[PDB]
DNA sequence: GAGAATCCCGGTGCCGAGGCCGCTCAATTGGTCGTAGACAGCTCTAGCACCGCTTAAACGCACGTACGCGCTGTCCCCCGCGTTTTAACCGCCAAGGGGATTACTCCCTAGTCTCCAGGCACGTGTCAGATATATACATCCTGTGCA
DNA sequence: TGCACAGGATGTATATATCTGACACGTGCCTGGAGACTAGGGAGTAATCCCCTTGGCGGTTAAAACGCGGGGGACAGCGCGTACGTGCGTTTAAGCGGTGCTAGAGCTGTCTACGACCAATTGAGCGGCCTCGGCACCGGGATTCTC
């Protein structure tokens, strides 16, 4: 049959996800995560769905900004693949230690 | 009772685009936006009026605040629109 | 009252709608009236007391 | 350089003046349009940015072109002769 | 399975929204730790706003003020 | 004897007296001048008009009649001064711009 | 005929300037610089003496804060020497554009 | 010639404050490029502050007030 | 092994950091009144929990090819250093221009009563999408026959 | 063994009929913004004093500018192998959606005690002035990296 170059259908998937605006994290594991992390500070705590939504959009926006900064720091480092030392450099030069 | 800027925002887009609908989420985005500029301008003006040992907030205080907060191009358009509106309001004679 | 150009003192035919300054012709509008800084138009209008 | 010499030889072998003056005026209008596109606050550059955004939703070169247009106008004036004042 | 409740292609989805090309395998638990350490700072402020309000439920406004605290303000749910 | 509001006295469509009310019981200063709510009303009206103009041609560039926050997000981040004003704010359901660095393309 | 290796006296004077805390910029050219950047907006400007020292402390602190980050960027770039892309990478990761 | 007021051994003085063994010779013109902008951004928000006070001398109080507006509240000279 | 280059130990004005008293406003005490937080008590939105069907996404094992990384060889440009030279800085005198402050004025903004229409809230109608008939015409594919 | 022709089947093509489907407009209401009237104190104007800061000296001196030899560093280039992407089989547990229940948001009523406001008072923290020892500065010997 006919195949594709590794690194070409990746660009199609990148442009598909960047034209898209849909949410990329599943709702129920995220709600379990925020309830298990809110159990540490105060028990018997209920939640509202728009609060979970605001938390979710905040975290994916911060993750997208961090991933763009890591990509920029990695292509500064004469490479293509991102590694954890670029994550540490981006967090160190972003202020959050 | 709850307050929104929905009708005023509505007529604002009706002068510029008559055949244009609006989303409720977009209306909430716009309401949060105008309220944020309002609280920023108000706290800048109150802080400046406290800094000049003055107990009165006037038009020149928010004039300096608009010069301070907004970037220069949108700043002089904003103060131009405000000056024509204020001079039109002050002609009550 | 007669109308005169605020920049040159000649006969003012047109008035700019932004800063309300009477000017004489096109190149006066392009060189002086259009790119002038704020705070200068009020001083130009101070001479005839129009601010 | 032989090609350049041959081109010069061909040039030596070589209402129309009013049409050339109209072309010089159109080149001046093109320089004005390039200056309007350079200023992003202008409506021409705003329309160009709107066209770029619609495609997304689907200055030294201008000075060199103006210098070349002035050279072409000078060549046309020399061909007419041979073959912005402060007072205003 | 709560900390790793975020599945393996989800960090990939957030990565290609961030415009990366090649992803390593050791980033995933580190991004999980970064996520949990951001979330720890956010919801601590959110539940302090919650127990000040004499309530045991976290509704829509004490979270948007919580992200308004550190300069990561979000629009739309301010009412 | 009956006369209309201060907003059309200033020729504005935003509420002047409501801005004055929010300024007075917003607790910013103990004395508030007369011309300040008119100036603030004009500034916020102009900013809303400019934002809705940008959302307008952003939505005409998608061939639609309604405003989605995709259009708002685009009209914010393709303009540089609104980029400088709204750098630290995140919009609800906005996404990101289509961008790719030059060496990451299949240059060959 | 005693010649030092390049960089040893650099590290030694680095140690003395880590001990030292005085101002490192000349005062009168800095006054000339702030007057020549200040005359553009309203002429005949008077200047207090303490404000210029506050400005000098500000630019020295901002130099230190940016230079530490570009040092970390150049260390991360597998090099000993700084360059222009280190500087705009630090300004990009700090968020200063 | 007055734009050359900051001098190359003073840039070396700032460079040996940061703790780097090797400094390339084209950093010195880059360091001026990041300086004439940045202090400019306090001059945009100092003298207009001064202009609001009917004031034709800048002092020690309005400059730290401008830095507090920018985000670098500094100690030592009042305010 | 030597040599710059330090850390360390002791003598010197000094000048800027601790008392001190004079005293002038600002914290303290008391009283009165009008309202705002506290508590009780109430009506319904909405959040938690659970069952079950559908299925699209996710986990796992397999392999294949760039790409991260190890080594190398070389221009070469920063680096340490001697020599001019140039402006930075300290001591100082003199002006005058601009900030602080005192002092009376008057207007306009705070406060209160009245009162009616602005904008909310909640009802009813009107052009865009989706299955459906439908018959005839045209194109494409498959089968058969012929050379 | 291939090619051409004929026949059959499928797809297309453009108003209907229905027919929802989510949108934009015609009436209540109530309360808060606007007009009218009173008070008082906050900018505002201005003049006067005195303090600092902008220019102008001059000498001298750390300190920048400039040219010069040599040595590691960044530069491109080439090979080794494996880690990431690509894929199909195989779960699985997200999603819809539906229902059942009750905590708890939210609103209303009433109350009284905390706090605004005002007048008299006493003391304490600002300031001017006075006096001296901690630290920088200078000089000279011990001591540690570097070559």
Author numbering:
A (entry chain A), G (entry chain E): 38 to 134
B (entry chain H): 36 to 128
C (entry chain S): 112 to 162
D (entry chain R): 439 to 452, 463 to 506, 547 to 571, 584 to 588
E (entry chain B), H (entry chain F): 25 to 103
F (entry chain G): 13 to 120
List passages from the publication reporting this PDB structure.
However, amongst these remodelers, the INO80 chromatin remodeler appears largely sufficient to generate the well positioned +1 and −1 nucleosomes. S.c INO80 is a multi-subunit complex consisting of 15 subunits that are divided into three different modules. The catalytic module with the Ino80 (ATPase) RecA lobes and insert, Arp5, Ies6, Ies2, Rvb1 and Rvb2, constitutes the core unit of INO80 (C-module). INO80 slides nucleosomes with 40 bp of flanking DNA ~100-fold slower than nucleosomes with 80 bp of flanking DNA, displaying a switch like response to flanking DNA length.
To test whether the reorientation of the Arp8 module was dependent on the species of histones used, we performed biochemical and structural studies of INO80 on nucleosomes containing S.c histones assembled on the 601-nucleosome positioning sequence (S.c nucleosomes) with either 80 or 40 bp of flanking DNA. We found that the remodeling rates of nucleosomes containing all S.c histones were within 2-fold of remodeling rates containing S.c H2A, H2B, H3 and X.l H4. Therefore, for all experiments except those in Fig. S6, we used X.l H4 instead of S.c H4 to make S.c nucleosomes as generating large amounts of X.l H4 is technically feasible. Shortening the flanking DNA from 80 to 40 bp for S.c nucleosomes reduced the remodeling rate of INO80 by ~100-fold. Two distinct classes were identified in this dataset for 0/40 S.c nucleosomes, with the grappler region of Arp5 adopting either a crossed or parallel conformation. These conformations have also been observed for INO80 bound to 0/80 nucleosomes, but the functional consequence of these conformations has not been identified. In comparison, for the INO80: S.c 0/80 (ADP/BeFx) and INO80: X.l 0/80 (ADP/BeFx) datasets, a much smaller proportion of particles fell in classes 1a and 1b. It is further informative that, for the INO80: S.c 0/40 (ADP/BeFx) and INO80: X.l 0/40 (ADP/BeFx) complexes, only a small proportion of particles have either clear or partial density for the Arp8 module on the flanking DNA. Our structures with 0/40 nucleosomes suggest that the Arp8 module sequesters the HSA away from flanking DNA thereby inhibiting its ability to bind flanking DNA.
